[PDB]
Design a protein around this ligand. Structure first.
Ligand SMILES: Nc1nc2c(ncn2[C@@H]2O[C@H](COP(=O)(O)OP(=O)(O)O)[C@@H](O)[C@H]2O)c(=O)[nH]1
Ligand SMILES: [Mg+2]
Length: 162
Protein backbone atom coordinates (compact mmCIF):
# COMPACT_ATOMS: atom_id res chain seq x y z
CA UNK A 1 0.00 0.00 0.00
CA UNK A 2 2.86 2.52 -0.58
CA UNK A 3 2.46 5.41 -2.97
CA UNK A 4 5.64 7.13 -4.26
CA UNK A 5 5.14 10.77 -5.32
CA UNK A 6 7.96 12.86 -6.88
CA UNK A 7 7.89 16.70 -6.88
CA UNK A 8 9.71 18.58 -9.67
CA UNK A 9 10.06 22.21 -10.78
CA UNK A 10 12.46 25.13 -10.85
CA UNK A 11 14.27 26.11 -7.70
CA UNK A 12 12.24 28.71 -5.74
CA UNK A 13 8.69 27.75 -6.69
CA UNK A 14 7.76 26.30 -3.31
CA UNK A 15 8.22 22.48 -3.73
CA UNK A 16 9.65 22.04 -0.21
CA UNK A 17 7.02 24.35 1.27
CA UNK A 18 4.21 22.41 -0.44
CA UNK A 19 5.52 19.18 1.02
CA UNK A 20 5.66 20.71 4.53
CA UNK A 21 2.14 22.10 4.19
CA UNK A 22 0.80 18.70 3.12
CA UNK A 23 2.77 16.53 5.55
CA UNK A 24 2.81 18.75 8.67
CA UNK A 25 0.16 21.45 8.00
CA UNK A 26 2.71 24.17 8.63
CA UNK A 27 4.67 26.92 6.87
CA UNK A 28 7.68 28.86 7.97
CA UNK A 29 9.55 31.50 6.04
CA UNK A 30 12.43 30.18 8.14
CA UNK A 31 12.03 26.56 7.00
CA UNK A 32 17.95 16.79 6.23
CA UNK A 33 19.06 13.19 5.52
CA UNK A 34 15.58 11.88 4.66
CA UNK A 35 15.07 11.03 1.01
CA UNK A 36 11.31 11.27 1.51
CA UNK A 37 8.67 12.26 4.05
CA UNK A 38 5.60 10.04 4.73
CA UNK A 39 1.99 10.94 5.32
CA UNK A 40 -0.98 8.61 5.81
CA UNK A 41 -3.61 9.13 3.10
CA UNK A 42 -7.13 9.26 4.67
CA UNK A 43 -10.33 8.73 2.65
CA UNK A 44 -14.17 8.82 3.00
CA UNK A 45 -13.83 6.15 5.65
CA UNK A 46 -12.94 3.97 2.68
CA UNK A 47 -9.30 2.88 2.20
CA UNK A 48 -5.87 4.01 3.42
CA UNK A 49 -2.30 4.19 2.14
CA UNK A 50 1.11 5.63 2.95
CA UNK A 51 2.33 8.37 0.63
CA UNK A 52 6.08 8.94 0.29
CA UNK A 53 6.79 12.50 -0.89
CA UNK A 54 10.21 12.75 -2.59
CA UNK A 55 11.53 16.34 -2.86
CA UNK A 56 14.45 17.13 -5.12
CA UNK A 57 16.10 18.18 -1.87
CA UNK A 58 16.58 4.30 -7.29
CA UNK A 59 15.20 7.86 -7.05
CA UNK A 60 12.78 7.19 -9.92
CA UNK A 61 12.23 3.49 -9.14
CA UNK A 62 8.60 2.84 -8.31
CA UNK A 63 7.19 6.38 -8.87
CA UNK A 64 3.38 6.39 -8.94
CA UNK A 65 2.78 10.12 -9.69
CA UNK A 66 4.93 13.10 -10.69
CA UNK A 67 3.94 16.65 -9.51
CA UNK A 68 5.20 19.57 -11.61
CA UNK A 69 5.33 22.93 -9.80
CA UNK A 70 5.56 26.47 -11.13
CA UNK A 71 5.26 29.87 -9.36
CA UNK A 72 2.50 32.17 -10.66
CA UNK A 73 4.83 35.12 -10.06
CA UNK A 74 7.69 33.66 -12.15
CA UNK A 75 7.11 33.31 -15.89
CA UNK A 76 10.22 31.23 -16.58
CA UNK A 77 9.10 28.61 -14.00
CA UNK A 78 5.88 28.18 -15.96
CA UNK A 79 7.66 28.06 -19.33
CA UNK A 80 9.71 25.16 -17.98
CA UNK A 81 6.77 22.92 -17.01
CA UNK A 82 6.76 20.89 -20.23
CA UNK A 83 10.53 20.54 -19.97
CA UNK A 84 10.14 19.02 -16.50
CA UNK A 85 7.40 16.59 -17.67
CA UNK A 86 9.68 15.48 -20.46
CA UNK A 87 12.79 15.26 -18.25
CA UNK A 88 10.88 12.90 -15.99
CA UNK A 89 9.71 10.72 -18.87
CA UNK A 90 13.15 10.54 -20.56
CA UNK A 91 14.87 9.40 -17.30
CA UNK A 92 12.23 7.57 -15.18
CA UNK A 93 11.65 4.44 -17.28
CA UNK A 94 7.99 4.23 -16.37
CA UNK A 95 6.02 1.20 -17.52
CA UNK A 96 3.57 3.21 -19.69
CA UNK A 97 4.59 6.78 -20.60
CA UNK A 98 1.22 7.18 -22.38
CA UNK A 99 -0.78 6.85 -19.16
CA UNK A 100 1.64 7.74 -16.31
CA UNK A 101 -0.02 10.48 -14.25
CA UNK A 102 1.26 14.04 -13.73
CA UNK A 103 -0.33 16.84 -11.73
CA UNK A 104 0.57 20.55 -12.22
CA UNK A 105 0.59 23.01 -9.31
CA UNK A 106 0.73 26.79 -9.83
CA UNK A 107 1.95 27.93 -6.39
CA UNK A 108 1.99 31.28 -4.56
CA UNK A 109 -1.62 32.14 -5.51
CA UNK A 110 -1.65 34.20 -2.26
CA UNK A 111 0.57 36.81 -3.93
CA UNK A 112 -0.77 40.29 -4.57
CA UNK A 113 -2.35 40.70 -8.00
CA UNK A 114 0.40 43.04 -9.15
CA UNK A 115 3.03 40.36 -8.76
CA UNK A 116 1.19 37.54 -10.55
CA UNK A 117 2.63 37.01 -14.05
CA UNK A 118 1.08 33.78 -15.23
CA UNK A 119 -2.62 33.73 -15.97
CA UNK A 120 -4.98 30.92 -15.02
CA UNK A 121 -6.06 30.65 -18.73
CA UNK A 122 -2.45 30.19 -19.84
CA UNK A 123 -1.95 27.38 -17.36
CA UNK A 124 -5.26 25.64 -18.21
CA UNK A 125 -4.32 25.76 -21.86
CA UNK A 126 -0.89 24.21 -21.17
CA UNK A 127 -2.30 21.50 -18.90
CA UNK A 128 -4.82 20.56 -21.59
CA UNK A 129 -2.14 20.54 -24.31
CA UNK A 130 0.04 18.11 -22.34
CA UNK A 131 -2.70 15.49 -22.14
CA UNK A 132 -5.42 16.90 -19.85
CA UNK A 133 -3.05 16.90 -16.84
CA UNK A 134 -4.94 18.07 -13.72
CA UNK A 135 -4.06 21.65 -12.69
CA UNK A 136 -4.42 23.24 -9.27
CA UNK A 137 -3.47 26.78 -8.16
CA UNK A 138 -2.12 26.67 -4.62
CA UNK A 139 -0.60 28.49 -1.68
CA UNK A 140 1.67 26.50 0.67
CA UNK A 141 1.99 29.70 2.73
CA UNK A 142 -1.71 30.45 3.25
CA UNK A 143 -3.10 26.87 3.06
CA UNK A 144 -5.02 27.52 -0.18
CA UNK A 145 -5.98 24.38 -2.14
CA UNK A 146 -3.00 22.17 -1.19
CA UNK A 147 -5.51 19.75 0.35
CA UNK A 148 -7.58 19.59 -2.90
CA UNK A 149 -4.50 19.18 -5.03
CA UNK A 150 -3.04 16.35 -2.91
CA UNK A 151 -6.39 14.58 -2.87
CA UNK A 152 -5.98 14.31 -6.69
CA UNK A 153 -2.26 13.44 -6.40
CA UNK A 154 -3.17 10.64 -4.00
CA UNK A 155 -6.05 9.40 -6.19
CA UNK A 156 -3.79 9.45 -9.26
CA UNK A 157 -1.05 7.59 -7.37
CA UNK A 158 -3.51 4.99 -6.02
CA UNK A 159 -4.77 4.31 -9.56
CA UNK A 160 -1.22 3.98 -10.92
CA UNK A 161 0.02 1.83 -8.07
CA UNK A 162 -2.81 -0.67 -8.55
N1 LIG B 1 4.11 33.94 -1.03
C1 LIG B 1 4.42 32.63 -1.02
N2 LIG B 1 5.71 32.29 -0.88
C2 LIG B 1 5.89 30.97 -0.88
C3 LIG B 1 4.95 30.00 -1.00
N3 LIG B 1 5.54 28.74 -0.95
C4 LIG B 1 6.85 28.96 -0.80
N4 LIG B 1 7.09 30.30 -0.75
C5 LIG B 1 8.51 30.96 -0.58
O1 LIG B 1 9.23 30.72 -1.75
C6 LIG B 1 10.62 30.45 -1.38
C7 LIG B 1 10.99 29.14 -2.01
O2 LIG B 1 10.29 28.11 -1.31
P1 LIG B 1 10.86 26.60 -1.30
O3 LIG B 1 9.76 25.78 -0.66
O4 LIG B 1 12.18 26.61 -0.64
O5 LIG B 1 10.99 26.34 -2.84
P2 LIG B 1 11.74 25.09 -3.66
O6 LIG B 1 13.11 25.66 -4.00
O7 LIG B 1 10.87 24.86 -4.85
O8 LIG B 1 11.78 23.94 -2.64
C8 LIG B 1 10.73 30.46 0.16
O9 LIG B 1 11.12 31.83 0.50
C9 LIG B 1 9.28 30.26 0.56
O10 LIG B 1 9.03 30.69 1.87
C10 LIG B 1 3.60 30.35 -1.15
O11 LIG B 1 2.64 29.57 -1.27
N5 LIG B 1 3.40 31.73 -1.15
MG1 LIG C 1 13.31 22.80 -1.99
Amino acid sequence: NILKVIILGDSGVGKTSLMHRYVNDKYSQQYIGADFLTKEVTVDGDKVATMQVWDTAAFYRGADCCVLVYDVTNASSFENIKSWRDEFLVHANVNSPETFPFVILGNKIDAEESKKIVSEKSAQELAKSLGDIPLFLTSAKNAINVDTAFEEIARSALQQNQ
